[PDB]
Enzyme design. Structure first.
Site, PDB file in Angstrom:
ATOM      1  N   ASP B  16      17.747 -48.148 138.198  1.00 48.58           N
ATOM      2  CA  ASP B  16      18.019 -47.944 136.660  1.00 48.58           C
ATOM      3  C   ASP B  16      17.467 -46.602 136.150  1.00 48.58           C
ATOM      4  O   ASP B  16      16.808 -46.404 135.014  1.00 48.58           O
ATOM      5  CB  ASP B  16      17.137 -49.123 135.771  1.00 48.58           C
ATOM      6  CG  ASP B  16      17.660 -50.305 136.142  1.00 48.58           C
ATOM      7  OD1 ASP B  16      18.607 -50.751 136.314  1.00 48.58           O
ATOM      8  OD2 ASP B  16      16.710 -51.031 137.049  1.00 48.58           O
ATOM      9  N   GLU B  17      17.640 -45.628 137.128  1.00 48.35           N
ATOM     10  CA  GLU B  17      16.778 -44.184 136.616  1.00 48.35           C
ATOM     11  C   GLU B  17      17.696 -43.528 135.888  1.00 48.35           C
ATOM     12  O   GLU B  17      17.504 -42.373 135.330  1.00 48.35           O
ATOM     13  CB  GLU B  17      16.876 -43.490 137.885  1.00 48.35           C
ATOM     14  CG  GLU B  17      15.881 -43.830 138.867  1.00 48.35           C
ATOM     15  CD  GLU B  17      16.565 -44.845 139.927  1.00 48.35           C
ATOM     16  OE1 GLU B  17      17.709 -45.606 139.671  1.00 48.35           O
ATOM     17  OE2 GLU B  17      15.644 -45.338 141.349  1.00 48.35           O
ATOM     18  N   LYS B  19      21.522 -42.848 136.041  1.00 45.28           N
ATOM     19  CA  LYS B  19      22.489 -42.210 136.573  1.00 45.28           C
ATOM     20  C   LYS B  19      23.797 -41.607 135.905  1.00 45.28           C
ATOM     21  O   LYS B  19      24.246 -40.857 136.301  1.00 45.28           O
ATOM     22  CB  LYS B  19      22.659 -42.538 138.000  1.00 45.28           C
ATOM     23  N   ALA B  42      25.487 -52.025 141.182  1.00 46.15           N
ATOM     24  CA  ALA B  42      25.673 -50.921 140.396  1.00 46.15           C
ATOM     25  C   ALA B  42      25.393 -51.307 139.118  1.00 46.15           C
ATOM     26  O   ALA B  42      25.475 -52.552 138.597  1.00 46.15           O
ATOM     27  CB  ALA B  42      26.739 -50.012 140.710  1.00 46.15           C
ATOM     28  N   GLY B  43      25.190 -50.270 138.213  1.00 44.38           N
ATOM     29  CA  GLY B  43      25.399 -50.497 136.965  1.00 44.38           C
ATOM     30  C   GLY B  43      25.876 -49.181 136.135  1.00 44.38           C
ATOM     31  O   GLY B  43      25.042 -48.214 136.090  1.00 44.38           O
ATOM     32  N   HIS B  44      27.044 -49.166 135.888  1.00 43.30           N
ATOM     33  CA  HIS B  44      27.429 -47.681 134.916  1.00 43.30           C
ATOM     34  C   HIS B  44      27.970 -48.222 133.752  1.00 43.30           C
ATOM     35  O   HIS B  44      28.988 -49.066 133.656  1.00 43.30           O
ATOM     36  CB  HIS B  44      28.524 -46.879 135.783  1.00 43.30           C
ATOM     37  CG  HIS B  44      28.947 -45.799 135.069  1.00 43.30           C
ATOM     38  ND1 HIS B  44      28.593 -44.405 135.543  1.00 43.30           N
ATOM     39  CD2 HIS B  44      29.759 -45.420 133.960  1.00 43.30           C
ATOM     40  CE1 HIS B  44      28.844 -43.650 134.849  1.00 43.30           C
ATOM     41  NE2 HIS B  44      29.534 -44.044 133.906  1.00 43.30           N
ATOM     42  N   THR B  45      27.398 -47.963 132.503  1.00 47.24           N
ATOM     43  CA  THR B  45      27.773 -48.471 131.267  1.00 47.24           C
ATOM     44  C   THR B  45      28.946 -47.492 130.356  1.00 47.24           C
ATOM     45  O   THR B  45      28.930 -46.305 130.815  1.00 47.24           O
ATOM     46  CB  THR B  45      26.471 -48.498 130.089  1.00 47.24           C
ATOM     47  OG1 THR B  45      25.693 -49.233 130.854  1.00 47.24           O
ATOM     48  CG2 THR B  45      26.965 -49.008 128.844  1.00 47.24           C
ATOM     49  N   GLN B 212      21.654 -48.519 144.303  1.00 46.63           N
ATOM     50  CA  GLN B 212      20.467 -49.002 144.135  1.00 46.63           C
ATOM     51  C   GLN B 212      19.268 -48.095 144.173  1.00 46.63           C
ATOM     52  O   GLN B 212      19.477 -47.008 144.979  1.00 46.63           O
ATOM     53  CB  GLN B 212      19.963 -50.162 145.005  1.00 46.63           C
ATOM     54  CG  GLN B 212      20.528 -51.477 144.438  1.00 46.63           C
ATOM     55  CD  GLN B 212      20.584 -52.649 145.492  1.00 46.63           C
ATOM     56  OE1 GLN B 212      21.179 -52.579 146.751  1.00 46.63           O
ATOM     57  NE2 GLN B 212      19.685 -53.587 145.332  1.00 46.63           N
ATOM     58  N   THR B 227      15.681 -54.349 148.901  1.00 46.33           N
ATOM     59  CA  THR B 227      17.037 -54.879 148.773  1.00 46.33           C
ATOM     60  C   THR B 227      17.373 -55.219 150.437  1.00 46.33           C
ATOM     61  O   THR B 227      16.584 -54.966 151.206  1.00 46.33           O
ATOM     62  CB  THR B 227      18.051 -54.009 148.178  1.00 46.33           C
ATOM     63  OG1 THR B 227      19.397 -54.913 147.930  1.00 46.33           O
ATOM     64  CG2 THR B 227      18.386 -52.747 149.111  1.00 46.33           C
ATOM     65  N   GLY B 298      19.452 -59.709 129.696  1.00 50.58           N
ATOM     66  CA  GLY B 298      18.850 -58.928 128.478  1.00 50.58           C
ATOM     67  C   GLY B 298      17.284 -58.951 128.653  1.00 50.58           C
ATOM     68  O   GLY B 298      16.934 -58.422 127.364  1.00 50.58           O
ATOM     69  N   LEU B 328      13.466 -38.117 129.375  1.00 53.32           N
ATOM     70  CA  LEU B 328      12.174 -37.319 129.093  1.00 53.32           C
ATOM     71  C   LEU B 328      12.087 -37.760 127.297  1.00 53.32           C
ATOM     72  O   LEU B 328      11.043 -37.960 127.104  1.00 53.32           O
ATOM     73  CB  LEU B 328      12.466 -35.909 129.054  1.00 53.32           C
ATOM     74  CG  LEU B 328      11.330 -35.025 128.782  1.00 53.32           C
ATOM     75  CD1 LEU B 328      10.181 -35.219 129.584  1.00 53.32           C
ATOM     76  CD2 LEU B 328      11.495 -33.610 128.495  1.00 53.32           C
ATOM     77  N   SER B 409      18.795 -34.147 132.595  1.00 58.81           N
ATOM     78  CA  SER B 409      19.680 -34.694 131.408  1.00 58.81           C
ATOM     79  C   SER B 409      18.896 -34.898 130.195  1.00 58.81           C
ATOM     80  O   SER B 409      18.114 -35.899 130.132  1.00 58.81           O
ATOM     81  CB  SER B 409      20.304 -35.870 132.141  1.00 58.81           C
ATOM     82  OG  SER B 409      21.238 -36.318 131.432  1.00 58.81           O
ATOM     83  N   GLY B 411      20.504 -35.979 127.306  1.00 51.28           N
ATOM     84  CA  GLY B 411      21.394 -36.584 126.187  1.00 51.28           C
ATOM     85  C   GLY B 411      22.672 -37.208 127.104  1.00 51.28           C
ATOM     86  O   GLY B 411      22.707 -36.790 128.398  1.00 51.28           O
TER      87      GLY B 411
END
Ligand SMILES: [Ca+2]
Ligand code: NA
Lengths: 424, 426
Positions: B16-17, B19, B42-45, B212, B227, B298, B328, B409, B411
């Site tokens: 959850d950095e 990415k 993974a998780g890409h929103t 991960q 993991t 959640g 940041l 990054s 934004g």
């Protein structure tokens, strides 16, 4: 070149003849690192299966990486032989705190499965996230607690599923914890030390210990080993980044072998398969002394498979080849190179994935006139017979990378050197 | 952009950095994006969460590879494909799935469910190392697929019913479910290893996308709170079928503070919703402002200060080339920010995260305290325009880490970025 490392791997299914070459490269390394496998290399004769081969050279540090599975009994047997032969070992042998242990019940699990060396079961516990590792030996109470949980499951499997015998908790605990005092002074943060070795400008050799075509992803699954062993595995298994894996030397026998089961497209001879009794294959086995070091069982033999080599070059990122056992071909009237396959009537130029497909491959061969000269001990390329040079020229073309070395005998100077692995 | 150069993008922490923006930013310069490890975790929103399909799919034309090191749930795959097709993307013609990819089957899900009383990922990796896994290619011989499934079910049903107290999984229903995916999967099955070799040989650039956090790595993380596979940068080599030399630049995505989800020691921890002894309002605020809520449950992640001793370890085990700092702006409001720069353990100094749960659990953080800037850093696109106190914080992170900060990054948009070095330029 300061701070430069080499990975030495077998490009085939093992028994490629890595020994002479590892020793040859160890003369330029300050550290030798095992990153995968278990205890699966020879004025007293001593055989090493676990301890890195660098231990033969004074002042070379030897590292057992986190990616190894370690039997303390096999370890201390080797140390003992080494010490009896006069070597100083323990102060320069460094064993990852995170190396996975092989316990007595892993060996029993192998035996119970067979009935119907514990390496698979150890990697199975690892992936299962219940493995006991080296560092765990140093808290007796929590070692006993995890052991207890592990034996509840594995004794359930042994007795209720495999129909076999339970493994005793207290005997197992006593045996394991009985290694703690001896292991303690060698336990180390190998990953950190390896970063420091290179930051100080020193060179490392990452020593492969199983043929890369036995890699659990890329080999003829399920007839593969219980871990990754491609050259990129050295990163995770030693605790270093892929950028430290500077040059990959692919040790390649001039013909192919396999031990055990698993398909083999270019196979000529298998003592246990009546349909594979090709006399050229029997010749390769005898002239090549292709018999197990311990068991004396003959290996399976076949022609060199350049389509398999090409897959190997891609999956390992081999920088250059070191050819071995050319001399086994000396005096053949002709030699063949498998350069691709027919499978389901289609042409394939790379070894396929998985046992099922690879068993369907019929080899497509190119034929070469043999040479008669002995090639034993030759140390310049130009001095090789023309017909040997033509065969190896074709191997380079199909493989897609240069031959950087040809080992022509057991002595350091019985070597054709085309490019030095440790020079950028 | 150097022809044939590749970038590996990994999280340097426990996941959850953040990415997403950076993986999109890198994908603008890549002709293929490769998943090499993990599963549908993974998780890409998107404005929708993609967990399996490589993130290259968002850019039209880019080839997306599911490498051999992945564990693949067909149902999860076809759910994502359908959401993407309904939103009007073209997916299938440029999605390439390794013949050797390990399958996740219903009994893997049942084994996880019985253990709880994720998503079958661990049990799939357990069958892999046990040398009994069914792989993608296996769906295309129905007879031998049934033969191996039968065998696997004999053993897994024995374990499920007699050991874990769960229900047997039925053979025929499982057989039917899995074979029902074959025709849809067929067009996408490929020799990913070969294709990646060819792409680089043609001088195209590839992005190897980590799933991960690398501190969850099975060898290097806080075992057993890890993991069920290797996920350090190096694992892209075995996992996609390429050599380590193709992994040219390793971009370390690093959040400006730390999170963990689920159990395991966490030296710089401030807030854990389930731990009454870890209820620091600062960590609560990190979770709210940082929006650190699991995508499924959640529930708030565990939060704490940035741990630079952990980063230092992560730099080493990954061969991180340069850092990308993220989130940041979550610290913009704070009076003061703290950096964990090492530990006290057994009364002695440690400068790197120790190995394994026990030693990490005994670490007390050693903090350096920085004056907060109390100023927005959202959208800043030059180092010099950062507030003095933000530059001071980050300079020290960089120092302790031992590698450069190559990107910040600031934004969600492509141009909300400080670029110090370009990952795809030698
Ligand atoms: Ca297609
Ligand atoms: Na020592």
């Amino acid at each position: 070149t300061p701070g430069r490392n080499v990975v030495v791997v077998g490009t085939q299914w093992g028994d490629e003849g890595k020994g002479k070459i590892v020793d040859w490269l160890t003369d330029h390394a300050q550290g030798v690192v095992r990153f995968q496998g278990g205890h699966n290399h020879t004025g007293k004769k001593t055989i090493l299966r676990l301890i890195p081969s660098g231990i033969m050279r004074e002042g070379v540090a030897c590292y057992i990486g986190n990616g190894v599975v370690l039997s303390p009994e096999a370890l201390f047997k080797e140390i003992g032989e080494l010490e009896e032969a006069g070597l100083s070992v323990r102060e320069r042998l460094f064993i990852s705190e995170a190396t996975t242990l092989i316990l007595p019940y892993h060996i029993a699990i192998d035996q119970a499965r067979e009935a119907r060396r514990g390496i698979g079961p150890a990697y199975e516990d690892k992936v299962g996230r219940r493995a006991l590792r080296v560092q765990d030996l140093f808290d007796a109470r929590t070692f006993a607690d995890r052991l207890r949980e592990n034996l509840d499951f594995h004794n359930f499997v042994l007795t209720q599923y495999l129909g076999g015998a339970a493994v005793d908790f207290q005997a197992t605990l006593d045996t394991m914890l009985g290694y703690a005092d001896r292991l303690r002074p060698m336990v180390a943060d190998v990953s950190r030390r390896l970063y420091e070795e290179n930051h100080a400008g020193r060179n490392l050799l990452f020593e492969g210990a199983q043929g890369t075509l036995l890699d659990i992803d890329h080999g003829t699954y399920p007839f593969v080993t219980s871990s990754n062993c491609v050259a990129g595995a050295a990163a995770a298994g030693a605790g270093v980044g892929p950028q430290k894996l500077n040059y990959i030397l692919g040790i390649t026998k001039a013909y192919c072998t396999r031990v055990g089961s698993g398909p083999f497209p270019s196979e000529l001879y298998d003592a246990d398969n009546p349909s594979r009794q090709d006399q050229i294959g029997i010749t390769l086995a005898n002239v090549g002394k292709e018999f197990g070091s311990v068991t004396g069982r003959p290996r399976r033999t076949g022609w060199l498979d350049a389509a398999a080599l090409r897959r190997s070059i891609q999956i390992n990122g081999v920088s250059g080849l070191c050819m071995t056992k050319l001399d086994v071909l000396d005096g053949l009237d002709e030699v063949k190179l498998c350069v691709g396959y027919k499978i389901d009537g289609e042409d394939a130029d790379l070894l396929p994935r998985g046992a099922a497909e690879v068993a369907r491959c019929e080899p497509v061969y190119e034929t070469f006139g043999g040479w008669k000269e002995s090639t034993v001990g030759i140390n310049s390329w130009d001095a090789l017979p023309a017909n040997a040079r033509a065969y190896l020229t074709r191997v380079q073309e199909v493989a897609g990378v240069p031959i950087d070395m040809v080992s022509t005998g057991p002595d350091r100077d019985e070597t054709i050197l085309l490019r030095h692995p440790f020079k950028v």
